Amino acid sequence: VMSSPALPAFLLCSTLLVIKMYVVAIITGQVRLRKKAFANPEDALRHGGPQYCRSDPDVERCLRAHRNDMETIYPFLFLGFVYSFLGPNPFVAWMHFLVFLVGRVAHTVAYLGKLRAPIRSVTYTLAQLPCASMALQILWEAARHL
Amino acid sequence: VMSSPALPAFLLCSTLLVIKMYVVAIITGQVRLRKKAFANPEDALRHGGPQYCRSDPDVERCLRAHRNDMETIYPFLFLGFVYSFLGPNPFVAWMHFLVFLVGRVAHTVAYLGKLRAPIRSVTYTLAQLPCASMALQILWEAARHL
Amino acid sequence: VMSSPALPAFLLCSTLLVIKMYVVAIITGQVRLRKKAFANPEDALRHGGPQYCRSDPDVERCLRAHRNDMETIYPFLFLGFVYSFLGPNPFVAWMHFLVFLVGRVAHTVAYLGKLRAPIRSVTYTLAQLPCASMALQILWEAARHL
Ligand SMILES: CCCCCCCCO[C@@H]1O[C@H](CO)[C@@H](O)[C@H](O)[C@H]1O
Numbered sequence: 001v002m003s004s005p006a007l008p009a010f011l012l013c014s015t016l017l018v019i020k021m022y023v024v025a026i027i028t029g030q031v032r033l034r035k036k037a038f039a040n041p042e043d044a045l046r047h048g049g050p051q052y053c054r055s056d057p058d059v060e061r062c063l064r065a066h067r068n069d070m071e072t073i074y075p076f077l078f079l080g081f082v083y084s085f086l087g088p089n090p091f092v093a094w095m096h097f098l099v100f101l102v103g104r105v106a107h108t109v110a111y112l113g114k115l116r117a118p119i120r121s122v123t124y125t126l127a128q129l130p131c132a133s134m135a136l137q138i139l140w141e142a143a144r145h146l
Numbered sequence: 147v148m149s150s151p152a153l154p155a156f157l158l159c160s161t162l163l164v165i166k167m168y169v170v171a172i173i174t175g176q177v178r179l180r181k182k183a184f185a186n187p188e189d190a191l192r193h194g195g196p197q198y199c200r201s202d203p204d205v206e207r208c209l210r211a212h213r214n215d216m217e218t219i220y221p222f223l224f225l226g227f228v229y230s231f232l233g234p235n236p237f238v239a240w241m242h243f244l245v246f247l248v249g250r251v252a253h254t255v256a257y258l259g260k261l262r263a264p265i266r267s268v269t270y271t272l273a274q275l276p277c278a279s280m281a282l283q284i285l286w287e288a289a290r291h292l
Numbered sequence: 293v294m295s296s297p298a299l300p301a302f303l304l305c306s307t308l309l310v311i312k313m314y315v316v317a318i319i320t321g322q323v324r325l326r327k328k329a330f331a332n333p334e335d336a337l338r339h340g341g342p343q344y345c346r347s348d349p350d351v352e353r354c355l356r357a358h359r360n361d362m363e364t365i366y367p368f369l370f371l372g373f374v375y376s377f378l379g380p381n382p383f384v385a386w387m388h389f390l391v392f393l394v395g396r397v398a399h400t401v402a403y404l405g406k407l408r409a410p411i412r413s414v415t416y417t418l419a420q421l422p423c424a425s426m427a428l429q430i431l432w433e434a435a436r437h438l
């Protein structure tokens with residue numbers, strides 16, 4: 001874990017974000033049960049009848065949050081890992097990771113909490129900035145070692 | 147591949163799971179062709195007419211299985227890789243990886259096979275346990291190296 | 293970045309593909325705004341009224357492209373990273389990475405550009421070939437080190 005100075009901070013933030021995705025999965029399942037809105041007939045038949053194989057807007061919202069997480073957190077897992085080994089200034093690296101972590105936690109709160117626009121969109125954009133920064137830094141390092 | 151004692155087992159299980167996702171992709175395409183249920187008008191027009199740009203419940207089921215795989219296997223790819231370098235007891239590490247592998251293969255069989263509830267849900271939960279375990283172990287290691 | 297001879301090429305292609313996914317995300321948002329097709333009521337109310345919380349076929353197409361990217365590029369990020377450390381012939385490794393990069397960029401152009409079938413399907417298949425190749429190579433290396 002001490003293979004580079006930024007790596008522990010990266011691994012902490014990454015793992016917290018993976019756990020935060022698992023929390024979204026748990027919430028999704030709870031909403032399905034409470035709203036009786038299942039995706040599969042076999043599930044519905046166990047939980048009250050075929051009429052409960054149906055869509056629900058709160059379930060759909062949970063799925064959108066989880067999807068957006070997969071669109072953003074998964075690339076961070078890759079970029080941040082690589083970036084950690086490029087010898088960034090450790091404080092600058094911490095700032096990239098913390099901005100991503102806080103932005104993404106805020107995004108889920110804004111999404112699942114139905115907060116007014118543009119709160120969710122701002123949190124998304126915030127969190128994408130350090131990702132864009134890391135991606136460009138990796139591109140320069142990779143290109144210059146070809 | 148021998149950078150740590152758990153790494154070969156991790157790479158074997160991971161790669162098998164990636165291949166298993168590719169199998170879901172292949173099945174999905176076959177179901178679209180057999181049910182004549184395409185997502186895009188350009189595809190439908192090549193395969194019999196515009197009426198075949200339509201949804202189908204078996205195609206939707208395949209997509210749900212693939213989505214659930216992306217929600218669970220992708221985090222395992224990250225967590226298990228990191229975990230392999232944390233000096234776990236090799237047998238304990240094997241058990242984490244094997245439980246995930248067997249649970250996830252069983253999940254796809256249960257999902258695509260339309261097995262009765264709660265078989266799929268149990269397989270999901272089974273497989274998530276080693277992921278939760280690895281995530282917490284990474285969190286402690288990362289935190290203690292800050 | 294010089295931990296193995298193939299690694300710089302891998303990191304270049306990977307990072308370009310992550311950026312290409314971000315481009316799909318940007319396009320998606322622009323299409324939502326231009327078509328006034330938002331997924332959430334809070335978004336619609338900010339952009340003209342509740343009637344604009346609605347689906348749109350161009351938005352749906354963008355989401356399909358992004359989903360297909362997550363189904364294919366994310367596994368490449370894992371496989372290609374591992375493969376880079378297995379001592380492949382560097383030119384052969386470059387060819388795997390370049391075929392994936394070109395195939396995936398072509399896939400997005402074909403998808404978002406609504407190009408006739410089977411252009412998108414061919415690009416998908418093209419790009420999957422080096423992934424299948426890397427996966428099998430990893431499987432043999434992992435298995436033989438058990
Ligand atoms: C990582 C998980 C974060 C979960 C954040 C959940 C935020 C829930 O927030 C709640 O949302 C409801 C609308 O959904 C409102 O009616 C409640 O008043 C609000 O507090």
Ligand SMILES: CCCCCCCCO[C@@H]1O[C@H](CO)[C@@H](O)[C@H](O)[C@H]1O
Nearest residue numbers: 166169170251254255256258259260
């Ligand atoms: C990794 C890929 C696993 C594929 C598992 C496919 C399981 C198919 O299982 C089949 O499903 C049908 C319902 O779909 C049933 O009608 C068949 O009897 C059943 O055998």
Ligand SMILES: CCCCCCCCO[C@@H]1O[C@H](CO)[C@@H](O)[C@H](O)[C@H]1O
Nearest residue numbers: 312315316397400401402404405406
């Ligand atoms: C990485 C991002 C690639 C973006 C490729 C966008 C291709 C857009 O291509 C455009 O698509 C339209 C149909 O959608 C056609 O009407 C236009 O004539 C065509 O040029």
Ligand SMILES: N[C@@H](CCC(=O)N[C@@H](CS)C(=O)NCC(=O)O)C(=O)O
Nearest residue numbers: 064065068120121124317320321331
């Ligand atoms: N797939 C996204 C791409 C753009 C994006 O990620 N937008 C942010 C800021 S508006 C978001 O939170 N989107 C909501 C979502 O993905 O459901 C979308 O459909 O909106």
Ligand SMILES: N[C@@H](CCC(=O)N[C@@H](CS)C(=O)NCC(=O)O)C(=O)O
Nearest residue numbers: 025028029039210211214266267270
């Ligand atoms: N996205 C999931 C989150 C919870 C989850 O993964 N549940 C498991 C056990 S019931 C599952 O197999 N879900 C089916 C699915 O994701 O389609 C869902 O909508 O259910």
Ligand SMILES: N[C@@H](CCC(=O)N[C@@H](CS)C(=O)NCC(=O)O)C(=O)O
Nearest residue numbers: 171174175185356357360412413416
């Ligand atoms: N999830 C895919 C699995 C198969 C696949 O990836 N097919 C390629 C070639 S036809 C594709 O471009 N699919 C379009 C898509 O995923 O929307 C699907 O539903 O088609």
